[PDB]
Amino acid sequence: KKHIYLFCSAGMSTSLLVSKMRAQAEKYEVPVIIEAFPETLAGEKGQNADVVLLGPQIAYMLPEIQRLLPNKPVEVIDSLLYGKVDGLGVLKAAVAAIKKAAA
């Protein structure tokens, strides 16, 4: 089971996206664990993720998070997919980042 960790300031507004992603992962039997955390834990929690996703509001922090976790694929969630709360779409992008990372 791969760990997909999302970051935002407190971990709420993204919490709704996480619940929809979990529903989708169950529907299609994707072996993943999805958790939302505030951006303050990106360095502490990110070390255990298989893929690190940043909320659209914290995109400006991408370079810093990449330097903090040089051994993890880190990327920003598409703002439209995020605004629309597209659990399936974001789940797809996360699995993709993992595949493109393992090869």
Binding site: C8, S9, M12, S13, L16, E39, I58, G83
Partner: protein, 103 residues
């Protein structure tokens, strides 16, 4: 909701950035850099002011969904904004004390 929810995320992030700047301002004071501290507080204040202004609108037109009831998120923004504003004010006082400490 769509905007209100995305707006709250922005407010939470803004409030978080405000605090971050405030703590950074304090750090400058510890380094004996009163000039940089002062500049950082000013920007932090401006950030909050803009955030507070947005919240003001969010409280004036909090109606729509129901009569007595209001948007629940109003609190996620108020809580973060109130905490950040208070923190900054106290931090400002703390910085002034550093100045009095001579250092």
């Amino acid at each position: 909701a769509e905007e209100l929810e995305e707006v709250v995320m922005g407010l939470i992030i803004n409030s978080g950035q405000a605090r971050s700047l405030a703590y950074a301002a304090l750090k400058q004071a510890k380094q004996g850099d009163f000039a940089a501290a002062k500049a950082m507080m000013d920007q932090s204040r401006m950030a909050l002011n803009e955030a507070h202004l947005v919240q003001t609108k969010l409280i004036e037109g909090d109606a729509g969904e129901g009569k007595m009831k209001v948007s629940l998120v109003l609190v996620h923004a108020q809580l973060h904004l109130m905490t950040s504003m208070l923190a900054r004010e106290l931090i400002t006082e703390l910085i002034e004390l550093h100045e009095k400490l001579k250092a």
